[PDB]
Design a protein around this ligand. Structure first.
Ligand SMILES: CC(C)(COP(=O)(O)OP(=O)(O)OC[C@H]1O[C@@H](n2cnc3c(N)ncnc32)[C@H](O)[C@@H]1OP(=O)(O)O)[C@@H](O)C(=O)NCCC(=O)NCCS
Ligand SMILES: CC(C)(COP(=O)(O)OP(=O)(O)OC[C@H]1O[C@@H](n2cnc3c(N)ncnc32)[C@H](O)[C@@H]1OP(=O)(O)O)[C@@H](O)C(=O)NCCC(=O)NCCS
Ligand SMILES: CC(C)(COP(=O)(O)OP(=O)(O)OC[C@H]1O[C@@H](n2cnc3c(N)ncnc32)[C@H](O)[C@@H]1OP(=O)(O)O)[C@@H](O)C(=O)NCCC(=O)NCCS
Ligand SMILES: CC(C)(COP(=O)(O)OP(=O)(O)OC[C@H]1O[C@@H](n2cnc3c(N)ncnc32)[C@H](O)[C@@H]1OP(=O)(O)O)[C@@H](O)C(=O)NCCC(=O)NCCS
Ligand code: SF4
Ligand code: SF4
Ligand code: SF4
Ligand code: SF4
Lengths: 330, 330, 330, 330
């Protein structure tokens, strides 16, 4: 495998929850006297007071640089065009890399099979995890997620972060005795590439698969920047609730290159009733569930009109005397 | 490879043009006294007069059946819900299978490496090719495509066929001395699955690739039943004009299984000026071309903000002291 | 008022149901031996046999002409680009105008206040009503609408007509002892112009109003050619179920002028459970209903964040010391 | 007229530029030592140093309150969920109302026909104008708009403001000797309600009209958070370039009330070549211009297939012997 797949599996093997790192972030948040709201300024003062790091807002960085840290003089420059929550994320990432280096190193050490480059990629993944666990302190964030019935927009509003950051954190609430809904988080683009997979436990799309066009995550770009929802049934009978939305943040100019992603959060149908997104939806009727697969070549459904490729198991008859609206049927 | 890939390659190796079969379709159209306009009605009586086949419009066929042929009674049943052009397509498909069986077998014989199942799939593909070349007689269709400046909707209106059928036929106009624009034809779904590839000549997506989310074909579902267009530049500098549109032919009920596809037609930029779809677009300015790829793992571009995966030829730079809006950058 | 408003009110006063005309269409359908399926051909033979009218499919008419009738030689020319159901509609319209002229004249005579031009416009409206009542014979169409739970696509498939034609006919099922769901039918464009209003009984948007942006009919263009649905609550507490879909049929060329409309069907919430479109929706929860109005200037809702104009009744305070996300609040 | 129309006309009569107020904002920005970048922080301390006003970021304000000012304690509370540029806008609005009160009163006095309520609405409009001219200092903003070729996203990024705010300021650059492109600015919703009109000079939609569904501004909701563009020709031959985009600023919860607007900027075609949005479009070909109107009842075009209502100057032709794809044709 490749290094990003190695690190995806590194997080999947740990149920997408790193107890030592999460508790470290929360403990530092509390001991520093942090308060939710305007964390970028408080994080600047924590960098200065605890690490001698001077944080400066720089509009002189290249267009694509979100931050740069100069370790010779200990100066952290943060992009002016980042919103406060993004600035705080950048600062907390660097905070993990300079202030939690040994804890990150030992956590990486717990997987001896990781390749040389996968270890650095995992270091960056764990720094991102720390930044998420610092911006969204575990007990407070879990506590608000339950009060708000998992409304991602309201969570982002209360904590001053975006949709993708909230979904990231929601997929990590696997602390023993204070678990949230077990989620699978995915990020896709317009061509169906899934560039992020994180899961609390085993799901169909945790590691591979996900190229079924009836899956609602791919429909997010058809209805941009509005939450889509679906009650999906996999070919093995297991049922899931999926919500997805496009994240499209540029301001790189009309001519510039644009980045467009969709973020999806899925869970077992049995949890759907605790989500605000199930409002108005009937969840006790298996006939209203949408039948999806994992990708046409690994999907054994026999009567799918959307089917793009034949199922690789077994083969269908070819009939010169029949025409059908079900491709590769028999 | 699998059999549908074998037949995709069978047609690709022949420049998507089967001269003997195409000329057979045109000669039969002319000798039978056919006329564009109501071809379904004329095809029914040509079946009766020439092959003793009785064509019946059956509203008792199963919901998913487009046709069924009973060779014992020589009875062809066609679905009532097919529009006239689709009925004509079904009848001409059966006409190829019963009246051009030996020439189709002889054409198949020219590829000795075809597997046993690939031969049946190729028989059905060649019957479809014949039906297309019969509904859209080569010389008449070519002259209409040039007169209409390749307006696909206007061609469908003149010949009483749909969008996908016109694009199919347009990608086959490789008869020596009467060439149309050389096209690559693709059919995709919302998850990026490309279920059809047909090519007049060598193109980047003739056989594999096409999972770039900046390619306009994947943007077709965001703007349904609207033609989208793009001037694309591949990483090797070669430039192309792409037109695409969703086809949604259903009415299987609100609850029923739904069919959603997008069809794309691509050509060299040098031909774009004879397309009606080039109206209003500047074609002589390489800075206005959109830079796309074939798929992130096989794309070597250095500064793509949309990038989903690291390029396999490259290596993963990791910088703990920098944050960037360019994922997996060089 | 203007003539189209005069005729809209002419139909509204009659509960959108013309008993004499509807029974005439159904009686002629039965006495002529018509059968659902391929009505265009049977209507051609009925024109010839009963009225001496020769029906011909003409590709020589101007682009915009659907039909033309030459009364000196009794020849009806029908556009080749019309699908069979549209051809049948055209033929039945002319059939009403030549074969039901006196019945139409007396029905018009029952409204003495109609202006001179409104009488001709009403003649055309009643001919259209006859064509709808002939293509969709009352007892058979009502009988299928109940069996199919009002699935508009399935009704169109069975009767070979489009979405707008089915919705038209569904809004007319007010025959005593065999009434369908009482519907209001509207047609809008992208700018909110409502160009058709028909209602079985009194509804909020029967004659005026309908410019509320939270009403789902205006959202149809955001999700083109897919059915949208909404449980709406008017400011007076009454609740309604709304379904809408875009109808976009051109083939007038990429450069040509395009016609894009959305068609909406609404009913009281108490009927929603008989629609297939209520599947998966909770209808016994007044908290999940969306609060809409009739247009901001005639809407008295006090806490609408979407509000575009102040409500004309009373006035709100202007406060220099407050900023609010509720425009024109107080 | 009503008071919001009175104030729309107050600004329209002044070419959407208030010279004394604009120069006051710029002079105060310069004399205070302000710098673009973190204006919310600098505005808080300018309030404290110059007016004794204590600015507080209050997460205890009601959900819908952007600000509240207590003049007894001179305490300005600003909503925590406002991004920095919006916070700066709120503070500068209050700054206009407390620190430029007499000049605003004097500017209002120049329109003696303003009703008593229109004067308060004009006071708030002028405070908003001051806030815009303070956040976006005239000469600096004008030079940046010219350097960036009017790229609205890039201007928002440089100045830390949103799309609507930039378009607002762009429509005000009518200072003699330093003119920007003369623009008309509109804000619409999904139902076609135009809730804002601001104009540098006389335009067709400066005061009324704008309900043409072929106008690209109404197409913005079909392509959400994507800039749409159009070369439009009014029925009198005059041609315009239009850019539009939806603004969706919410996160009031999945169930909460939602805000959806589209903002459009229009100018003479002769200026289109200095816009970045003109990249790739041919502007010297009047056949490629789209023919639009001001609203169907006030539009005299003869062959519009989209037409919703009969033109009021015309008369209704009715032909019982013809069917046409042109509703209400001449
Ligand atoms: C996959 C990756 C390359 C994508 O890069 P990118 O597309 O440039 O985007 P980023 O993930 O850096 O940031 C985008 C959003 O994700 C959010 N995010 C990323 N990791 C997060 C985490 N662990 N917790 C919370 N939020 C997180 C950021 O806050 C950001 O929100 P914003 O856009 O509103 O500012 C990048 O996330 C990465 O390097 N991750 C670490 C390696 C890893 O875990 N790989 C496994 C892949 S499954
Ligand atoms: C690939 C395949 C299974 C797809 O099946 P499907 O999804 O049921 O769709 P079909 O292709 O049968 O029909 C869809 C449209 O394509 C059109 N079409 C298909 N082949 C055509 C041809 N050779 N010429 C013109 N039109 C054609 C049909 O007319 C139809 O138009 P319509 O929707 O208005 O009725 C089927 O086309 C097939 O078996 N093709 C032959 C095998 C082959 O060539 N495989 C390699 C393809 S990569
Ligand atoms: C309003 C009007 C001018 C619109 O014209 P148009 O936009 O050219 O469209 P048409 O209504 O002629 O036809 C469009 C669809 O409506 C359908 N339709 C129209 N009247 C119908 C009726 N009474 N029953 C069933 N279907 C009907 C047609 O079948 C057609 O379906 P199709 O597009 O798939 O072929 C036209 O309907 C008319 O003249 N109506 C009669 C006058 C009237 O009743 N005015 C009151 C206005 S509320
Ligand atoms: C019309 C009105 C009620 C709309 O209220 P609203 O829908 O709550 O929206 P607001 O205009 O208050 O704010 C929305 C955006 O417009 C921007 N805006 C408003 N006036 C502006 C100005 N003069 N310059 C720059 N930006 C301005 C705000 O900054 C805000 O940007 P944001 O969304 O990123 O925060 C309100 O703008 C108003 O009272 N205006 C003054 C009265 C007036 O001029 N009326 C005639 C208009 S036709
Ligand atoms: S066969 Fe149908 S259900 Fe299975 S993956 Fe393909 S589209 Fe999805
Ligand atoms: S790296 Fe960028 S250009 Fe290349 S395939 Fe991926 S998205 Fe397309
Ligand atoms: S005030 Fe709100 S609910 Fe009322 S019509 Fe306007 S947008 Fe609709
Ligand atoms: S008649 Fe046509 S061009 Fe004129 S306003 Fe109506 S839709 Fe627009």
């Amino acid at each position: 495998p490749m290094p990003f797949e190695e690190v995806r599996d590194f997080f999947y093997d740990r149920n997408n929850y790193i107890h030592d790192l999460d508790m470290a972030a929360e403990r530092m948040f509390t001991e520093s006297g942090m308060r939710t709201g305007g964390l970028d300024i408080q994080l600047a003062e924590l960098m200065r007071d605890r690490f001698g790091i001077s944080v400066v807002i720089d509009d002189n960085l290249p267009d694509t640089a979100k931050r740069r840290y100069h370790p010779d003089t200990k100066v952290l420059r943060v992009a002016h065009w980042l919103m406060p929550g993004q600035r705080a994320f950048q600062i907390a990432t660097q905070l993990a890399l300079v202030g939690q280096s040994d804890l990150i190193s030992s956590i990486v050490a717990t997987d001896d099979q990781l390749s040389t480059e996968a270890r650095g990629v995992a270091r960056i993944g764990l720094a991102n995890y720390f930044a998420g666990a610092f911006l969204l302190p575990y007990r407070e964030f879990h506590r608000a997620a339950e009060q708000l019935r998992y409304d991602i927009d309201l969570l982002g509003r209360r904590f001053g972060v975006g949709f993708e950051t909230v979904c990231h954190r929601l997929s990590t609430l696997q602390r023993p005795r204070q678990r949230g809904i077990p989620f699978i988080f995915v990020r896709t683009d317009k061509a169906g590439n899934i560039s992020k997979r994180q899961s609390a436990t085993a799901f169909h799309f945790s590691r591979v698969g996900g190229s079924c066009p009836l899956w609602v995550v791919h429909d997010a770009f058809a209805q941009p920047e509005r939450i889509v929802r679906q009650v999906a049934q996999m070919p093995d009978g297991r049922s899931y609730f999926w919500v997805a939305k496009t994240t499209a943040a540029d301001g790189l100019g009309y001519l510039g290159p644009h980045k467009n992603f969709a973020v999806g959060l899925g869970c077992d149908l049995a949890h759907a009733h605790k989500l605000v997104y199930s409002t108005g939806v009937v969840l006790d009727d298996p006939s209203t569930e949408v039948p999806i697969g994992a990708g046409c070549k690994i999907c054994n459904r026999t009567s799918c009109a959307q089917r793009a490729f034949p199922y690789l198991g077994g083969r269908v008859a070819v009939d010169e005397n029949a025409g059908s609206s079900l491709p590769y049927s028999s």
